[PDB]
Design a protein around this ligand. Sequence first.
Ligand SMILES: [Cl-]
Ligand SMILES: [Cl-]
Lengths: 295, 296, 297, 295
Amino acid sequence: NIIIGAMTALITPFKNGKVDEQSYARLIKRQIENGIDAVVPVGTTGESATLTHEEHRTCIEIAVETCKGTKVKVLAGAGSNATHEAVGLAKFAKEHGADGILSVAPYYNKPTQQGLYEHYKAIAQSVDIPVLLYNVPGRTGCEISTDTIIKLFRDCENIYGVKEASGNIDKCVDLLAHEPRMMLISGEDAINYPILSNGGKGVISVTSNLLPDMISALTHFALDENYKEAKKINDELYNINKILFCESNPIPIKTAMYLAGLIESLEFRLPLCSPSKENFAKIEEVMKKYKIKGF
Amino acid sequence: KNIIIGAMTALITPFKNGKVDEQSYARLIKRQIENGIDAVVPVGTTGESATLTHEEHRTCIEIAVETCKGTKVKVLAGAGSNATHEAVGLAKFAKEHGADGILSVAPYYNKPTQQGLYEHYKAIAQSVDIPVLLYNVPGRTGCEISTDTIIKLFRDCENIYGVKEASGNIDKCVDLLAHEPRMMLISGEDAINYPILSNGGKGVISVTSNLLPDMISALTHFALDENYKEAKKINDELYNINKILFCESNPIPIKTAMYLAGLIESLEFRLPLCSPSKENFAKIEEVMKKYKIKGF
Amino acid sequence: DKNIIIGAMTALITPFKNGKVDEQSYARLIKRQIENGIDAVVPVGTTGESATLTHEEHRTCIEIAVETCKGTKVKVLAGAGSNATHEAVGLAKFAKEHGADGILSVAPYYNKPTQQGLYEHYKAIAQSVDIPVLLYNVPGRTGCEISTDTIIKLFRDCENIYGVKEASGNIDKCVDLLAHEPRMMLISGEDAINYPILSNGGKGVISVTSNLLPDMISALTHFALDENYKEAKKINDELYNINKILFCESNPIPIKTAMYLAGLIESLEFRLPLCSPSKENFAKIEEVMKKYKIKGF
Amino acid sequence: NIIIGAMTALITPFKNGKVDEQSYARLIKRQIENGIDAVVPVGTTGESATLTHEEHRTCIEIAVETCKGTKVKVLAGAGSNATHEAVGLAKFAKEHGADGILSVAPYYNKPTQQGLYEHYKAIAQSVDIPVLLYNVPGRTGCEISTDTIIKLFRDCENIYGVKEASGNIDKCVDLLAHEPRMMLISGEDAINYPILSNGGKGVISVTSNLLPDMISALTHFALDENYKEAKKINDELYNINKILFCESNPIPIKTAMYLAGLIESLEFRLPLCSPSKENFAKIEEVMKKYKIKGF
Ligand SMILES: [Cl-]
Ligand SMILES: [Cl-]
C-alpha cells in the first residue's frame, strides 16, 4: 500500500489573515485536472509551522473531500519534533480521511539515529495507513541516515519510502542499491529527473503548484522509462526550479502564484514575508518564459 | 537598556515517570543560585522545550521565579517559536508569570529571511516591556541572524539588549562588538566561553554549569574582572567536559551526567530524545571522574 | 564540431618499484585496460600521483601510454595541469609533443583563482595547443569551484575545450550544465555516481574503479551510451560498495592497495606524503575486493 | 629557538612580469622600521605557487640581506605537496640564510594524518632551524588534526608551533589547553586578538603589508597583556581585515598597496588577476578610514 507518482506540496493561500478555503479547494481541483496523482496538504510549502491545529484539520479535510471520487490521493502533512504530538497528528490525519502521511524528521532538537528510529516507529504503529519519511537536513538540522531509513522501511510495514530533499545523489544511489523495494520520492524539483531515472517512483513538488501539467508529464514519462522526454522537460524547468528557491520556499512559489493571478492576496504569516523587491523582479522575469495553465 | 548578564544556566528539565519532577527542579535551581549563578533559563533547548506542554512551560517558569525571589538572580525565560504569533504569546506569557526577561530563539525549520527575522523579533519586542535576548544557533534552526540584523534589532528596539551566540564563529563575535560595542554578547557555547568573554562578551548561558556551576561562575566573573589568566585557566580545564557534553545532542549528555552524579533521580527524556549509546554513557562517566562536582 | 575524447576511461595508477616508475608494469597495465574494452587512458592524473612525479617521469608515463595504445582505437588523455598558468601551458605542450590525443587539466589548486582568473588560465592553455582540453573540477581537492557559467564560456570561446570532468557530487550542477549547453561532454569523475551522470546525458567516465574492474566500468558506460539504462544502473548498484571503499582513505591509496592485493602490481609503494593504509583499512580493502570478479592479464 | 611576535606574509611585487627587487627590498625596510619582528618571503601572500626556484632564491636573499644588522628574522616559505620537494626547499631555505621555515600542509593530494606526520618529520629532520606548521584547510583540502600537530610538536625538537588559518577558535583552545608550550600563530587577521588573548604568541599577517605599525602595536600590546589596547586596534582593523579577503588573497592586498602608492603597478601572475571593478571600489573606500604609513 503506497502513495507515489506526481505529487504537489500545496501552498496555503491567505486572505485577511485567514485561510482562503474556497481558493484552497479551487487550487486542488486545478491540480487534479492536470494529471497530478496526489496532493500534500500542510507540508513546508503549506506553511505548516504557522497554521493552528484547526487550520491543519480544515486543509486536510478540504483536500480529502475535494479528491473524493477521483483517483487522486491525499498524503497529509503530519509531523512534529515532539513524538507525542507527531503521533497525535498522524492519528488525526487518518481520522480525517487521509490516504497516508508525510512525516518530517524532527527539527531543531536534533535527535540521535536511535531517537529518530523510535520516533517514526511510534508514529507508524499508531496508524494503519502508509507513512512516508521526509529528510531535509538543511531545515531540520539533522539527517535520517541511509541505515535508519532502511531499518524503518524493513521493520514497519506501513513505512514505504522517503521524500529526499538533501541535494545528494550519492545517497539516492546508496538507498536504492541496498533497498530497491522502497519508494524514493524527489523533494527537490531541479533534480526530479535524476532521482527518477535511478529508480525513484515519484515527486513531491513545489513547481507543480504553478506548472502541474509539466511536472505531471515529466514524472509519468520517467515512470514509463521514456527518459528522453522526461529529461527534456526537466531541462526546460531548470530555471523556474531554481528561481523558486531564490528565497526560502514557499515565499517564491506564493509570489509566483500571485503574479499568475492564481491566488488573490500575497499574504504570509510571520516570520515568513514578501520577497525582497530584487527577488520579486527575478521571479517575474523567469515566469515570462513559461506557459501557465489557469482554471 | 535593562540587561540580564553574567554567569547564567540553561536549566535541564528532570522527568520522573514521564512527568516533570517539580521538587527536583526547584532543588537544582537553588543549587545554581548558591553557586554564584546570576540568572537561570527555564525551558530552553537544554530544558527540552520542544516536548513540554504549555502547562509544564508555565510550571517551570513559576518554580524558577519563586525559587529566585528575594535573591537577585534573574529568570531569563525560554520563549521562542518559529511562528511569530506563538512567539509573541509565549513572551507575554513569560512576563505574566514573573520572568525578568526572555530568551527567544531564531525561528527553526521554516528558514525566514533577514527581513522576516527582523519583523519576527520586532513583534516580540513590542509585546512586552522586559529585556529580550536574541538567540542564534544555525546548526539547530537552519538559519542565521546576520550581524547586520542583530545590530539593527538592538538599535531599533529598546528592550532588545544583545544576543546569545552558538555558532562557533569568533569572527562574527568580533564583527558584532566592533560595530556595536554597547550590546551584550552572550556565549552559548561552553568550550569557547573565555574567548567570547575576553573579546568583551558580558556573560554565558551555559550547559556545563548544570553540573559545575561554581567553575562556570568563577570563569565568568574572573573574566568580567579582567583577570584573564584565571578565566583562561578554568576554560582550559573545562575543555574536556565541555566537549564530552556534546558527544550526542544536548541535553542528552548533560542529563546523563547529572544522573551519574546523583543530582537527578531518573534518566528520562521525551521522544524523539533518548538515552545515549552505552559507549557514550561510559565516556561521560569517565570524563566526569576528573572534576570536583559540587553537591546540594 | 569540436574534437573529443569520451567513453569509458581509466585514471591510471603509477606503479613504483624501489621508488622508481615501473615502466614494464605500467605498459602491461595499459594493455589490460585495452583488452577489457576501455576507450581511453589517463596517465599521470591524481590517481597516478601526479603531484610527486618529476617532469621527466611525467614525460615517460605519457610516452608509454601513447606507444602502448598505438594500433588500437584507445586514446590517451594525458594529465597536464598546474596551479601556475605558465607551468600548465608548458605541460600541455609536452603532452602534445609526446603524442597525447588530448589533455586533462585540473583547476588551479591552493591559490584559489577567481572565476575571471580561471577563465584566463584555461584560455591561455587552450590557445597554446591544438588538441582537445577536458576541464577538471574537483573542489574538495583544489579549494575552488569552476562555475557553470565559466565552463560554458570556455567551451564557447575556445575551440579545443570540449567538456569537463566533474568530481563535486553535485547532480544539480550537471543538470545546469547540459540544460544550457547540450553540446558539452560531461564526464563523471566520481565512480559511485557514474550512472546518474550518464543518464542525464554525460558521455563518459574517468574512473578509479576501472583500474581493478575495467570490464565492469566499460560495460556500464557502453550500456548507458547505448541507452540501456536498466543494465547500466544494475552494474552501478553492484559497484557501489567497491566504489565507496576505494575512498576509505584518499585516492589512490586504496586502489593501489587493491591492485597489489590482486597481484596486478609487484610492490605496494607510495611517494610521501602518501603512504600505506592502516592495517584495518587494509583488511577492509581485501574484504571488498574478494567480492568481485577481477580480470587477470 | 623560536620565531614569534608580529610577522608579515610579504607580497611579491612584479614589474613588467618580473620580480621587482628594488620594490621588494624597499617594502621589507618599511616593515622593519615599523616594528615588525619577522618577515615571511614567498608564502601564499607572496604568490609562492607561480614563482620559479630562482625567484624563490632571489626573494629569500633580499629578505635576509635587508634584515641584516637588525634582530628581525626571516621565516621563509618552504613547503610542497611532495615530500621530496618540501625537504629540498627546506634545505634550500637554510642554505640561503633563512632563520626558520613556514611549511604548508600538502595541498590537493589529501594525505592521511599518518602521511602528514611523516611529511613534516622528514622536513624537520633535514634542517636544524625552526619549523612552523601551516594549516589552511580551505586552500589545501586537508586538515592537520590537533593530535597530529601536538605529536609533531612533541616528537620533533625544531617544530615549534603552527600557523592556523581555519576560522576555528575551538581548535585554538584545544591546541593550547593540551599543549601550552607550542607557539600558536594567527594566520587570520580578523581574529588576531582572540587568538593572542588565548595564548597565541604572534601573527603572520596579510594586513601588516599595508598597516605594519598597527599590526605590530596590536601584537605587542597583547604580548604585554594589555588586552584593552590590543582589542581596540583589532576592532578598528576589522573592516580592512575583511575587505582584504573580498576576493582571494593576495588579490585585495596588492590592490590596496597599489592604491596606497606602495607598489607602482597592479600586477599578478596568472591564474591570479585584478579584482572586479566593484571590489576594487570597495577596497578603495574602506582604505579611506585608515592612516597608511609611507616609506
Ligand atoms: Cl513541503
Ligand atoms: Cl584522476
